[PDB]
Symmetry: D3
Amino acid sequence: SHMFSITVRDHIMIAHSFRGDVFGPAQRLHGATFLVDATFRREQLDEDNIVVDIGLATQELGAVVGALNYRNLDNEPDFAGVNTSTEFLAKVIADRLAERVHKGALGEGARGLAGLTVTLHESHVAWASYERAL
Amino acid sequence: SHMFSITVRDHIMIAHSFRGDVFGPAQRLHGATFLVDATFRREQLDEDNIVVDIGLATQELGAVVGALNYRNLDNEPDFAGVNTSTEFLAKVIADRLAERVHKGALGEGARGLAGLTVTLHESHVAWASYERAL
Amino acid sequence: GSHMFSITVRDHIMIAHSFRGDVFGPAQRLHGATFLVDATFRREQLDEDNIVVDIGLATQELGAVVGALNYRNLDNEPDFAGVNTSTEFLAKVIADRLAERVHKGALGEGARGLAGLTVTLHESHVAWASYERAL
Amino acid sequence: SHMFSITVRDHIMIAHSFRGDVFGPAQRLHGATFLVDATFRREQLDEDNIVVDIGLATQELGAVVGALNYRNLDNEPDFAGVNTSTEFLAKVIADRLAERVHKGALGEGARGLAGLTVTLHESHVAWASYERAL
Amino acid sequence: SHMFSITVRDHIMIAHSFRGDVFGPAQRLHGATFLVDATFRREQLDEDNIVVDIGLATQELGAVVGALNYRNLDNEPDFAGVNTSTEFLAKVIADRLAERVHKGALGEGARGLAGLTVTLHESHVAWASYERAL
Amino acid sequence: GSHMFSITVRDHIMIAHSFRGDVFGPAQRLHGATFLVDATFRREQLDEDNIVVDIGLATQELGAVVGALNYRNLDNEPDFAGVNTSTEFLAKVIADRLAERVHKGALGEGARGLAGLTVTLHESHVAWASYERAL
Ligand SMILES: [Cl-]
Ligand SMILES: [Cl-]
Ligand SMILES: [Cl-]
Ligand code: NA
Ligand code: NA
């Protein structure tokens, strides 16, 4: 079998705290920079010979993460009572991107994408990902 | 199940332009430095306890991308009329590497490889890949 | 499948070794390497704390695994007697040892629900290797 | 004596060729991706406790490199007869940034900057820089 | 003349907000992961043929940034009413390391250092530094 | 104090060594490292080709310098007997050898106009050292 992909990178800077003794000092209100990498995959190149319009990909990724950027996530109703771990946020961003694909925001071609992955890098030594089908 | 891999990195520096409104300013003649990462995978290590002869892997990758380096791909006969997107080129390189694996250029042990992936990095914020079986 | 979560943590080791076989050229001489060691843990559903694995335990257990290898000439390590300690070989060694720790509960009871592990070793800016397995 | 700085990163993708036997295969029309890092330095923080309006910094870097991006520099009258080496282009961008600072485009406070450095990365294995006082 | 240096990297994860129009959305409480690189310089290697005891360098850097880690800096008494910009924090960390050097915490040999630079990376596209003599 | 141009090229080596002195802890044992080797050449004015230095000659000569060090146990080298081959020490070794080659004309006659060089060795993702000198 075979598969093509493209990945584009953005980033966000947020505040949050975690619930649970397991988190140790991360129970305190702190924050992070996450590099946000969105990978789009598909089995065959589209009629422009690409996986997805990078302009739309970067735009739409920007639209998704723009709603999270420069925020204290502990105050965000969408996340009330939920630990906003790096892996959780990877899924949040993946799902919001997936909805934009389904809505045609990445072009009619992007309806033929097979899946996507969102990877968040919280430091030089830790990163998390969420992969899903489309 | 399980899988071993190794990856080696080379790079090329090219010019190209794209055909299609989708591309915006990339319709203009421009260029790219592509970091080219070739990943070779197999289920069991060979008789030397490796995935592939790394010297032959770098040699053969060097030979493949050497045909593209320092060129304007718009004027390359192999790509006449075709958009040489990052993802398209990743397949071109992967298939050329596979051809060399099947001709024995990466050693007889390389015929045991399960597959390969080629990843091209266009910048610090965009990259593409193609995966295939061997 | 439908989806997969993962987290990766990075450590590093600095070792000496040499290889057997003419295929290796100058690497037949005793030399060394810095390996960046990335351990990736993957699972289908987040645990009750909303994470893939307790990061504190993941880094501790990865630290303990690679600490046994660090600052050593692997050519004189009994565990690797007669074997080429290639980057890809070492990735499996580290992966398998991490797995053993997962299976003894050392990364938390939740870690028993992990789907798999990948270990990637980076020997330089231009060569890296990996091993992927199920748990 | 002490010094503060901040650095912001952008990138361009261009085509060019070089004149002279010294350049070997780079005498052919090809191209490159340059990561462009602009460093602004000052001896004392301004009244907002910063080196420079980072927003204006990232915007102004964007403006400057925007005039170069997605172009064959061989066709740019500004560079007629001149080798557009990585080090030369670092100077071009530094000089254009300097003029923007003088004109007030990075804010009145940016005239208190001591100097700047522009670094262009043409690959994972080569980069060039130009440093100048303001 | 000539100069030796060594650099060690640590990181912290913090929350903060800024005061001032210039900051735009960064006036909201957010956060950052800062990669913290401490550079120690000297003219001649010490008796062990090094710039500084790297164990003590990392230990002392660890102690300095450990007092900042996992905190909302807006609520830290040390920074009350002050914008905790990347560049300002670089100086805070440099000065705290200098104090430790002068009390002998990096070894008696470290009293021979010429200077320090601390660089904080807020993302893949923005970083700041502060340089001082010892 | 007006301005300065520079170019940097990257190579790497993979070596074994040990350190002498209790200060070094486990690094007193024979181990190894991958050093990414960055050579920076600086000058005030571009040459007649509009460059800092012939990049082909810079990479060739850096490659020649590091090649003499590569895939070796540096503990065995007579020139380094009695000397801890720390990252910072090796940066100067490489810088001094590059300087010799500049001064012999091996990087082109233009390179005689260089103001200086810096060599930076990266031993891991979290430690690096440099040596800066005039030419
Ligand atoms: Cl939760
Ligand atoms: Cl096409
Ligand atoms: Cl302030
Ligand atoms: Na709390
Ligand atoms: Na579909």
